[PDB]
Design a protein around this nucleic acid. Structure first.
Ligand SMILES: [K+]
Ligand SMILES: [Mg+2]
Ligand SMILES: [Mg+2]
Ligand SMILES: [Mg+2]
Ligand SMILES: [Mg+2]
Ligand SMILES: [Mg+2]
Ligand SMILES: [Mg+2]
Ligand SMILES: [Mg+2]
Ligand SMILES: [Mg+2]
Ligand SMILES: [Mg+2]
Ligand SMILES: [Mg+2]
Ligand SMILES: [Mg+2]
Ligand SMILES: [Mg+2]
Ligand SMILES: [Mg+2]
Ligand SMILES: [Mg+2]
Ligand SMILES: [Mg+2]
Ligand SMILES: [Mg+2]
Ligand SMILES: [Mg+2]
Ligand SMILES: [Mg+2]
Ligand SMILES: [Mg+2]
Ligand SMILES: [Mg+2]
Ligand SMILES: [Mg+2]
Ligand SMILES: [Mg+2]
Ligand SMILES: [Mg+2]
Lengths: 136, 99, 101, 198, 132, 208
RNA sequence: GAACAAUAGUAAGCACAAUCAUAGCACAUAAAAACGUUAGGUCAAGGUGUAGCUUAUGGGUUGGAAAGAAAUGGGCUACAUUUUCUACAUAAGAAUAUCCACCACACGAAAGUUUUUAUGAAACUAAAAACCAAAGGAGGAUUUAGCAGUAAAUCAAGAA
């Protein structure tokens, strides 16, 4: 998780306070050999993220800019599965799940009007929905 | 930064007229010294002061020729005359305190 | 007559700087470059300091052309702050008005 | 009734407040009695008509363009931030500000609450598709500007009675609060330097 | 109390012209600028040379026409030519007025190296706007 | 104030407009609101028609704000409600049959009830008479009592907390303490009552 | 020197008012604020009355005005946890005055030492880095400012 960190620059410095390349680290260097497709009888599931990324903008989420020139170069071919937000069917299921555990404790949270506000504020996004439901 | 980029950077500099060979940060000031006009030669500097000598002398001669009448200079002369009448004028050279 | 002896000194100072402006520039070029040998730069420092004292751009002082106030002078009009108000309040300067916003 | 200044210009003579009040009260006594034809002409010379007073807004008619149905345009401005909002009445619930999704563009929960406020008041959160273009100001200035633009742009799709409800809630009125200047001789707009009495 | 270019109230016996009857904060509100030129624009140079030349004319015209000058000059600069508009009382004979007009036009033109226009309007006395 | 005297405070509650036909006097009130053509101020940025807001939360959120960080103040108020919710949820799980349907898991109910127990009933104001100051009790108004309770909450959790313990968790503890009438804030409320009762014979000094 | 169900006052001038500016109005803010008071401040912006100097109280050249026992005013940075560091706009990771068998550590030098850069004939002036980590743990009597986009926090440019 966070495969983009195997090629991007590293914050860690040395005694001279000069940045070190990501290949200097032994853990990354050996783990790098674990993603180059040469062995048999195995499958690897990867995920390029942004929360823990270094020197990457907030808006960027597509695989190429997160990996960069070098990261994308040493990863082809792959299957870029896209993770989306909630669909209307999923959104109702998640809200009903919390109501079964009595999580949404607001008096008017049980009505459809509260559901509409949750849909608009969270943009039917699982990450934002959890933060909202934690205090309403 | 590759050898290809070095040639292109130098080749572009040759045509547009900049410095081709590498130059230090401090060594570029000599180019700046001749590229710009020195401070002491700008028209704002050496022509900063209007020539008061010509302005004063011209109106001095026109005053004596009756073409320009200056009230302020007349005021000094009129008061200067009264000081002479009252007995308090400017002594000549070598008359201040040696006597 | 300039309005004060100080103003007269500045005119002499500006005149002397103009005469030695090009000669100073040529010698000062040698000092400000690190590619020439250090031996030549030391000789240049002796020559540039042998020039007359008044022929220095830093010694030039910006005064008012009317009252010769050493400070409080706007560079655009070359006038003291008191004289500038005296001309501007009477409407004798184009485009200058009391600020209101 | 005639203003004292207007009355002085009708009699071509200066008057006083006590004299004007006495004259007006006398007309009220004359006007409270049964009225004759001659008196009404005399009284009407002292009558003045006020202009039309109304606070209803001008409803912008819906515009159709290139097979596009029920799209209106709105203009909003608040605290050095202008917002241009066009709302389509035939789409789902989504807002595209400056070519990006509104959730990404407004991370702050409060800012996304401002955009909800017009739509939630009309119970049409998911019945409109919008695209916006706002420039200048901070996060809150833009959020307020987009809120104002939607309120004016949504008046076309809403009945007239609820438009009055919109005004009573403060959606349609521009915010006049703008940053003041810094006076010469003071630390800020109102704060002055420390005043040592002795 | 502000005192810049103001005439103080003294009963009702002192005449005041239009220019002197307005405080300096009324500039560009009730009265215009006595001089107009390009030097004080946004991106224009040569503003100090115009100012010193303007002041000299305020002192030359006032001294060339002693007593007969009504009020302040008006200086207009178009292209490279300089136009001076003045109000002069009926004091000198017309022979002397044309002498001074001819003298002023030639002397200033050869001094500032620019053509000079001198237009005169004659009034019987100083124009009074308030008091009196 | 850029708003003139004619401008009035807007009405935000949506329910006030959607059901006006069930009353007559209130109908006359808002029909004349626009018939008089009275101008309406712009909607404030803080207040909104969202059903999940609460006026007592906004006032408490504003006081926690230092400088101009409304985001930080709102973030702290969000965590504190979450922190209270987590603690009550954990206590509900580890309880007997009779104890289960006693614990309250609604932070808003806890927050509203906590402040109504920290409000003093009678305050003190110094009065100068005879060259000396006498602490004279007075019947503090409801707005002052409500404001005074909030200030005591903020003052306590800002001063005598440890440097390691975070603000959201420290405030959460005091809310539960005040909910059970045992917090130091409740002790401070009683202390103000102790002084007021001691000077019960000086109430004659006040002239209102 | 006024009594409006009016009893000696009248019409003009200046000021307030109104108007103008801050590109709609409104509000608000600017701007304005007479006659006088304090022999208020300014002969050193400049001019000038009176008094004084005139091989000198004038003019020019060269070098030099150090230094803080101590007291005080107005400010910037702090004394941290609503904080510090890094990435980045605001959903993250890490540090956190204490423990100790040894160690070593938080916040906070803007100061000081050294090196270098910028301007300049001259660096004593300014800025950057390395090293260094001191007072400071919310301040006695007393006291200043602010009524809403104001206080407060934060960022930027310009004048010379
Ligand atoms: K004198
Ligand atoms: Mg002098
Ligand atoms: Mg050097
Ligand atoms: Mg200098
Ligand atoms: Mg401030
Ligand atoms: Mg009046
Ligand atoms: Mg206006
Ligand atoms: Mg006003
Ligand atoms: Mg003012
Ligand atoms: Mg006014
Ligand atoms: Mg005195
Ligand atoms: Mg005093
Ligand atoms: Mg004095
Ligand atoms: Mg003098
Ligand atoms: Mg003196
Ligand atoms: Mg004298
Ligand atoms: Mg001497
Ligand atoms: Mg002290
Ligand atoms: Mg000060
Ligand atoms: Mg800091
Ligand atoms: Mg964190
Ligand atoms: Mg530290
Ligand atoms: Mg530090
Ligand atoms: Mg330092």
């Amino acid at each position: 998780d966070g495969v983009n960190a195997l090629w991007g620059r590293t914050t860690l410095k040395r005694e001279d306070k000069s940045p070190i390349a990501p290949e200097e680290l032994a853990l990354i260097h050996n783990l790098r050999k674990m993603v180059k497709n040469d062995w048999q009888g195995g499958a690897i599931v990867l995920t390029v993220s942004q929360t823990g990324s270094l020197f990457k903008p907030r808006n960027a989420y597509l695989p190429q800019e997160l990996l960069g020139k070098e990261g994308f170069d040493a990863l082809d071919p792959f299957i870029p599965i896209l993770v989306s937000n909630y669909n209307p069917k999923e959104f109702e299921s998640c809200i009903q799940y919390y109501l079964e555990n009595n999580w949404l404790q607001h008096e008017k949270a049980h009505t459809e009007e509260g559901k509409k506000e949750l849909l608009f504020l969270s943009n039917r996004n699982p990450g934002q929905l959890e933060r909202l439901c934690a205090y309403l | 930064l590759s050898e290809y980029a070095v040639r292109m950077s130098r080749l572009s500099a040759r045509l547009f007229g900049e410095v081709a060979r590498p130059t230090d940060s401090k060594s570029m000031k000599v180019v700046k010294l001749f590229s710009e006009q020195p401070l002491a030669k700008r028209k704002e500097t050496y022509d900063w002061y209007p020539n008061h000598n010509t302005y004063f002398a011209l109106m001095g001669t026109l005053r004596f020729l009756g073409l320009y009448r200056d009230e302020h200079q007349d005021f000094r002369d009129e008061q200067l005359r009264l000081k002479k009448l009252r007995g308090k004028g400017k002594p000549r050279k070598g008359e201040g305190k040696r006597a | 007559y300039y309005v004060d002896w100080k103003m007269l000194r500045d005119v002499k100072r500006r005149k002397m700087a103009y005469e030695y402006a090009d000669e100073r520039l040529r010698i000062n070029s040698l000092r400000k470059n690190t590619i020439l040998p250090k031996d030549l730069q030391e000789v240049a420092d002796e020559e540039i300091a042998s020039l007359p004292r008044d022929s220095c751009p830093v010694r030039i002082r910006n005064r008012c052309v009317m009252t010769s106030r050493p400070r409080g002078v706007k560079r655009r009009w070359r006038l003291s702050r008191i004289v500038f108000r005296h001309l501007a309040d009477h409407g004798q300067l184009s485009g200058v008005q009391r600020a209101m916003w | 009734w005639l203003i004292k200044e207007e009355l002085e210009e009708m009699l071509v003579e200066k008057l006083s407040d006590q004299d004007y009040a006495q004259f007006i009260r006398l007309l009220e006594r004359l006007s409270a009695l049964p009225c004759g034809a001659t008196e009404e002409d005399f009284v009407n010379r002292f009558r003045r008509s006020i202009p039309i007073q109304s606070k209803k807004q001008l409803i912008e008619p819906l515009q159709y363009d290139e097979q596009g149905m029920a799209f209106s345009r709105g203009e909003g401005k608040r605290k050095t931030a202008k917002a241009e909002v066009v709302v389509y009445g035939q789409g789902s619930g989504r807002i595209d500000v400056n070519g990006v999704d509104y959730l990404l563009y407004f991370p702050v929960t409060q800012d996304r609450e401002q955009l909800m406020f017009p739509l939630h008041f009309l119970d049409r959160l998911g019945k409109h598709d919008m695209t916006c273009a706002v420039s200048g100001g901070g996060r809150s200035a833009q959020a307020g500007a987009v809120r104002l633009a939607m309120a004016r742009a949504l008046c076309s799709f809403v009945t007239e009675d609820e438009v009055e409800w919109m005004r009573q809630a403060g959606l349609l009125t521009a915010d006049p609060r703008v940053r003041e200047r810094k006076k010469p001789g003071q630390e800020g707009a109102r704060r002055k330097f420390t005043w040592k009495k002795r | 109390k502000n005192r810049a270019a103001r005439v103080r109230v003294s009963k009702g016996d002192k005449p005041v012209t239009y220019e002197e009857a307005h405080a300096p904060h009324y500039i560009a509100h009730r009265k215009g600028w006595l001089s107009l030129h390009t030097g004080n624009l946004d991106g224009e140079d040569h503003a100090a040379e115009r100012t010193v030349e303007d002041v000299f004319l305020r002192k030359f015209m006032l001294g060339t026409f002693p007593g007969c000058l009504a009020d302040q000059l008006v200086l207009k600069r178009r292209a490279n030519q300089l136009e001076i508009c003045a109000l002069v009382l009926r004091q000198l004979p017309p022979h002397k007025f044309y002498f001074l007009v001819g003298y002023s036009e030639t002397l200033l033109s050869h001094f500032y190296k620019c053509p000079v226009h001198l237009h005169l309007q004659t009034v019987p006395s100083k124009v009074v706007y308030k008091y009196i | 104030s850029r708003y003139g005297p004619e401008y009035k405070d807007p009405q935000i509650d949506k329910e006030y407009y959607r059901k006006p036909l069930a009353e007559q006097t209130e109908e006359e009130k808002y029909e004349r609101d626009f018939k008089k053509t009275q101008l309406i101020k712009a909607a404030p940025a803080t207040k909104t028609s969202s059903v999940f807001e609460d006026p007592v939360i906004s006032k408490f959120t504003n006081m926690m704000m230092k400088g101009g960080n409304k985001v930080l103040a709102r973030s702290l108020m969000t965590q504190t409600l979450e922190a209270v919710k987590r603690k009550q949820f954990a206590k509900y799980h580890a309880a007997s049959a009779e104890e289960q349907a006693t614990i309250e898991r609604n932070p808003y109910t806890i927050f509203h009830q906590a402040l109504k127990n920290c409000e003093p009933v009678i305050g003190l104001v110094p009065i100068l008479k005879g060259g000396h100051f006498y602490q004279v009790p007075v019947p503090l108004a409801d707005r002052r009592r409500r404001f005074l309770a909030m200030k005591w909450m903020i003052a306590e959790c800002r001063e005598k907390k440890h440097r390691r313990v975070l603000m959201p968790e420290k405030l959460s503890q005091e809310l539960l303490e005040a909910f059970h009438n045992q917090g130091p804030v409740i002790k401070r409320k009683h202390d103000m009552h102790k002084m007021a009762e001691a000077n019960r014979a000086l109430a004659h000094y006040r002239w209102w």
